[PDB]
Amino acid sequence: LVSDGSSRPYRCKIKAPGFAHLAGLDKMSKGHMLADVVAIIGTQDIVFGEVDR
Amino acid sequence: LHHAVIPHGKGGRSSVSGIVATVFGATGFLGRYLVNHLGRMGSQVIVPYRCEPYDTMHLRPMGDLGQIIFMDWNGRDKDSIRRAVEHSNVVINLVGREWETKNFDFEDVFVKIPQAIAQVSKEAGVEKFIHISHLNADIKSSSKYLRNKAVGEKEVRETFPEATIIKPADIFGREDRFLNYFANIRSLGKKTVKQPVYIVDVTKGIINAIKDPDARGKTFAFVGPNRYLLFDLVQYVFAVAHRPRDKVERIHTTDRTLPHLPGLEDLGVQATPLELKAIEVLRRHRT
Amino acid sequence: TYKYVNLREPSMDMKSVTDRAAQTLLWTELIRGLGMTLSYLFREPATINYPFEKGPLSPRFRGEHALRRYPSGEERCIACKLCEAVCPAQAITIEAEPRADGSRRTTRYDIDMTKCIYCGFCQEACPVDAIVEGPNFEFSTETHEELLYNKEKLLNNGDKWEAEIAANIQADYLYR
Amino acid sequence: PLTLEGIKDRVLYVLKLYDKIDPEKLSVNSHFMKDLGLDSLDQVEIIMAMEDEFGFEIPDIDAEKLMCPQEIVDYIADKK
Amino acid sequence: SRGEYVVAKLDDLINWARRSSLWPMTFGLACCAVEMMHMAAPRYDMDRFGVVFRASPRQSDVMIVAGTLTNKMAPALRKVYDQMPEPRYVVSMGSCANGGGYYHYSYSVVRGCDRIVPVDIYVPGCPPTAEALLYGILQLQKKIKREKRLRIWYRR
Amino acid sequence: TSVKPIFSRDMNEAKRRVRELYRAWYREVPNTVHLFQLDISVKQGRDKVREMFKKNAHVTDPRVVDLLVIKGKMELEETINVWKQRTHVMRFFHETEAPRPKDFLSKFYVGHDP
Amino acid sequence: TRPTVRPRNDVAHKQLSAFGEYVAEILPKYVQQVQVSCFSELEICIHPDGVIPVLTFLRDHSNAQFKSLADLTAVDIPTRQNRFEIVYNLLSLRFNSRIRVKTYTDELTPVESSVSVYKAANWYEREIWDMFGVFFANHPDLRRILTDYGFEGHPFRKDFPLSGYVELRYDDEVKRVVAEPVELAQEFRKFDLNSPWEAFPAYRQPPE
Ligand SMILES: NC(=O)C1=CN([C@@H]2O[C@H](COP(=O)(O)OP(=O)(O)OC[C@H]3O[C@@H](n4cnc5c(N)ncnc54)[C@H](OP(=O)(O)O)[C@@H]3O)[C@@H](O)[C@H]2O)C=CC1
Ligand code: SF4
Ligand code: SF4
Ligand code: SF4
């Protein structure tokens, strides 16, 4: 949170574990196949709303 | 006139524009594009249908929130038609099946339908009534189609005389009839000179004429830019498309210009050629 | 404090290694999974017959957006604009006028059912409990025109019932 | 069959083939940029158009240094 | 008028055959997808209504647009809509999807899915409760009960 | 006053990079108009490309020219891939009116647009 | 003062004060502010040249480990010539403490692309480039991620308004989806909530 002396926040921002987990997908899946990639997307819990910020 | 019929601000997406249009038809081709360009203009369209609401459903979201409105009509009673044209600024008449049915001929749709709607219109007090017609529909032979359209032309000219009787040539587009029959072939080869006019210049002309007053009373006719042979056009269609009785007689019948009545140039719209839009629309061939 | 996993070894004793070989070549715990799933087969399944049996709820559900009124009296709303001041998608639209009597009232009280996220802030913000989140949740509306409530629609929807709303509030006017 | 005059003739008819040039009006000292009313946009159009016509890549600084028909012909005579 | 009698009976049979199973495709962008999977749950059934949840777009009877439609989403959404058989119906689920909703005043968001595909059944809520969504599918079935296609074809 | 520019020293390197970027856009157009199964002649597309270049010719500040070159390179990458669809490429064009001219009296009929 | 008001520890305040004084003394080349709030979370305010040297110091040295990287944002503050604020956030695995490395920057001059020492900063830097336009020289790949491709404007600025300039709709004219200038259906009303009367006397700035 970034707050002016105010009732409105000046700037909020969210550190998202979904975004951080999706960030390393190439190095997590350099040596496998596509169903294993779907299992990689599964094995890090995803909502795809929080990954957006 | 009352407020909320005057224009307001810019155009598009429920900006309150001028005309409130009662449209007969609009489930077909040209009426659907006309509702599309009035929705781009931002005009309220009252359309009655007679069919299943699924057709008016897949042409429903053209307008903004609650702009266009759907109701019912029938080809028999004046009460439903009059209820549909109780409060209307402008009204357009587009109707017609190109084959006779069990309950309708080429007669009495083109004859009986403009009679009752023009009756309740002239008793109603509508303005800028635009009635379509096929080009060169005569008293002459070869088509119950064309002669019943000529009778309807004489009717709309005689009663309610300040109607814009409008006619394009045989139009081509995304859902053309005759270019589809050119695709749905087999064959035969004849000669006829012919000018094709693309659909969006036609409907742009119709919306410009219906929103621009002082251009009333005069019948209009739309002109194709090329005007060459039919069989050369069929060779052009097969070349661009990569592959080597009533409709065929009514395309071989008559295609001429008339120096009496004014066309595109008194409206100020650019004409799109056959070649550009034909290359745009001739998809769905082999790869 | 931590309690981690996967710290063992396959036991080199003959019985344990031939048991792992028996599971490998005899398909055992797969059939154990089949037995567990057949045990859930022989249960009675927990379904509800939907059009006849409706699923249970709470006395504080947030549904219909109905209005209330006074006992044999007039409209409960004052048009004090608190609900439009708190409405986090601004779906409330209030234009207020007083009538010929003198008490301050409205002209236009519109709820957009599209924008309504169903918080409950307009219920908590109402000082006189004029707007109340309703009990029933069946809108299912075939046209987008019909999903924009007017104040008269809200009054008809508050006069189709109060006894449900009054029973829920009279049960739970003590928590909130 | 690769002389200076054959390259100049093929450069000549592709200058004929370019549309906005009015007329061709070839000269060894033509300078079609300012003496014929053209843009540096049209300069780089013609330079990479010759690149599209008959060969080597013609990079940016040598694309800048030409500004002239016969100097293009002589630069190709240097490079080809 | 046994011609009309056969038309009415055959129309009843074919429309009951349409509204009987109605397997959808779950498009399901945001948390409305989670509530759709909660009406896929063992309490609120879908087996009873012939309704099979299925990701296949090629055989989609109805389509439940749910979640939050964006500008980046919309051409791919209508491309999903195109490769679909012409008897088709649309349930717009969710305040986000049936008119913009809580993200109505924003950029990158189409103001409801009315501006892309036509909508038969709007069901509002955030999330629209699985009970209420199942009610909306019942009123969709009653819309299928009133369609009169073969009546219009016979007296056309 | 210390300002660190991106690439530029004078506008010579600016001219050099923008003419190379225009060469890249020229050899970019026909492959894309063939790949996306588009509906526009190549002449019209190239003329709208060079019209978009000629829109911002009024900038002499070299950092701004560098940032324009970097933006154009970004969108040339994203259109030389298949990452951008038919919608964005048509969105560069304007075939849906948008009819608004700059006449005084035309803006006086459909008013309140000074 | 004691019930329902959160008490604090002056011990952690003294620890962070001494630590920030230590870091300020031993990297004098770029330290401008070392400020400590009331609830003991450290802030170090840094010139935009010592990005790589200060982060290479703060990753290591066995007195401030701070391996854990978090948020990056550049809080858009006008009424300045250096507008944007790049905020590194660092967490120590070994010491359980939070330091905020606020370096300042302007619109067009790059800071030096912290992805060289921080492998978590890659999509963070790509996000800041997409939403703001803070350029990052010596970076592998800068693209637009968390925006549309054909959209531009760098929307998390203050110059970009709430609604976008463009708005999509499908049309059957050209049989596809097109963008138009924005035609809102309602105003997005603006409540003048900035009430007077000085709710905090301690944070008064000196007027002119
Ligand atoms: N090249 C061309 O095709 C040209 C055509 N025209 C004219 O333009 C008009 C529109 O053409 P087009 O779209 O191709 O054809 P359509 O048949 O699709 O248009 C007629 C419309 O009126 C409806 N309609 C027709 N007959 C009846 C009826 N008996 N009862 C109820 N509704 C009826 C149609 O179906 P529904 O009932 O389902 O709504 C449709 O909505 C026609 O009148 C045609 O003559 C003019 C010049 C050139
Ligand atoms: S808060 Fe209650 S009384 Fe006040 S305007 Fe809203 S509904 Fe009316
Ligand atoms: S529940 Fe609906 S009407 Fe009430 S404050 Fe929330 S969005 Fe507004
Ligand atoms: S309406 Fe509510 S539950 Fe549905 S997608 Fe939007 S935020 Fe999620």
DSSP string for B217-247 = S--EE---S--EEHHHHHHHHHHHTS---HH
Do D72 and D66 contact (CB within 8 A), yes or no?
yes
For chain F, give every domain's residue range: 1-114
Max Cα–Cα distance, chain F, nearest Å: 52
Task: Give the tokens for residue B212.
Answer: 């621009």
**Given 3-state DSSP classes, what are the helix, strand and coil percentages for chain C, each rounded to the nearest 5?**
35, 10, 55
Atom of ligand 2 nearest to the CA of C129: 2
Ligand 3 pocket at CB < 6 A: C 86-89, 91-92, 111, 116-122
**B-chain residues near F39 (CB < 8 A):** 279-280
Domain tally, chain B = 1
Task: Give the tokens for residue B216.
Answer: 């009333």
- Select from E102, E94, E124 the least CA-distant residue to C139: E124
CA F38, CA G174: separation in Å to the nearest integer? 11
- CA–chain centroid gap for G80, Å, is 16
Rounded-to-10 torsion of CA F92, F94, F96, F100: 130
Query: CA separation (Å) from D66 to B39, C61, D24, D48, G13?
Result: 54, 79, 18, 12, 70
CA F54, CA G19: separation in Å to the nearest integer? 57
Q: What is the CATH number of the domain that holds C134?
A: 3.30.70.3270
- Beta-ladder partners of G74: G86
Q: Is C116–E139 a contact, with Cβ atoms under 8 angstroms apart?
A: no
Kindly state whether B54 is in contact with chain C, defined as any CB-CB distance less than 8 angstroms.
no
Domain extent, residue B102, equals: 1-287
Residues listed for chain G: 208
Considering only CB atoms, F113 lies closest to which of B10, B40, B276, namely: B10
- CA–chain centroid gap for B140, Å, is 23
* Ligand found nearest the CA of B166: 1
| H-helix segments, chain B | 30-41, 53-58, 78-84, 112-122, 144-158, 178-183, 199-211, 230-240, 246-252, 274-281
Atom of ligand 2 nearest to the CA of C128: 3
Query: What angle is formed at CA D60 by the lines to CA D55 and CA D63, rounded to 5 degrees?
Result: 65
- Select from G31, G48, G59 the least CA-distant residue to G117: G59
- Give me the helix-helix angle, B112-122 and B144-158, nearest 10°: 10
Method for this entry: cryo-EM
Cis ω on the peptide bond leading into residue D23 (within 30° of 0)? yes
CA C9, CA B72: separation in Å to the nearest integer? 79
Considering only CB atoms, E107 lies closest to which of G155, G176, G177, namely: G155
Kindly state whether F16 is in contact with chain E, defined as any CB-CB distance less than 8 angstroms.
no
Q: Which residues have C-beta within 8 Å of that of residue G77, sequence separation ≥ 6? A: G83, G84, G85
Between strands B197-198 and G31-36, the pairing is unpaired
Query: What angle is formed at CA C148 by the lines to CA C145 and CA C151, rounded to 5 degrees?
Result: 130
Nominal resolution in Å?
A: 6.5
**Closest-CA distance of chain F to residue D46, Å:** 10
Domain extent, residue C145, equals: 64-175
Is the shortest distance between the CB of C126 and ligand 2 below 6 Å? yes
Q: Is C90–G186 a contact, with Cβ atoms under 8 angstroms apart?
A: yes
Three-state DSSP class for C98? strand
**G-chain residues near F95 (CB < 8 A):** 173-174
Between strands E89-93 and E121-123, the pairing is parallel
Instruction: Mark residue C159 as left, alpha or beta (left: phi above 0; alpha: psi -120 to 50; beta: remaining).
Output: alpha
Q: Kindly report the backbone phi and psi dihedral angles of residue F88, in degrees, each rounded to the nearest multiple of 5, phi listed first.
A: -70, -35
- Select from B31, B200, B254, B12 the least CA-distant residue to B130: B31
Query: What angle is formed at CA E58 by the lines to CA E56 and CA E60, rounded to 5 degrees?
Result: 70
Task: Please report the number of interchain residue pairs, chain B to chain F, with beta-carbon separation below 8 angstroms.
Answer: 15
Name the architecture of domain E2-156. Answer: 3-Layer(aba) Sandwich (3.40)
The chains found to touch A (3+ Cβ pairs under 8 angstroms) are G
Kindly state whether E119 is in contact with chain C, defined as any CB-CB distance less than 8 angstroms.
yes
DSSP string, E44-96: S-STTTT------STT-SEEEE-S--BTTTHHHHHHHHHSS-SS-EEEEESTT
CA F24, CA F41: separation in Å to the nearest integer? 19
Name the architecture of domain D6-80. Answer: Orthogonal Bundle (1.10)
**B-chain residues near C144 (CB < 8 A):** 65-66
Atom of ligand 1 nearest to the CA of B29: 13
Task: Give the tokens for residue D37.
Answer: 């009313």
CA B138, CA B149: separation in Å to the nearest integer? 8
Task: Please report the number of interchain residue pairs, chain B to chain C, with beta-carbon separation below 8 angstroms.
Answer: 4
Considering only CB atoms, B65 lies closest to which of G172, G180, G185, namely: G185
| Interface list for A 29-48 with G (CB within 8 A) | none
Between strands C92-95 and C66-67, the pairing is unpaired
CB burial readout B252-269, b (16+ within 10 A) else e = ebbbeeeeeeebbeebeb
Which of E135, E139, E141 to probe the C interface (max C CBs under 10 A)?
Answer: E135
- Beta-ladder partners of C98: C104
Which of B10, B13, B207 to probe the G interface (max G CBs under 10 A)?
Answer: B13
Instruction: Mark residue A4 as left, alpha or beta (left: phi above 0; alpha: psi -120 to 50; beta: remaining).
Output: beta
* Ligand found nearest the CA of C82: 2
- Beta-ladder partners of B71: B48
For chain E, give every domain's residue range: 2-156
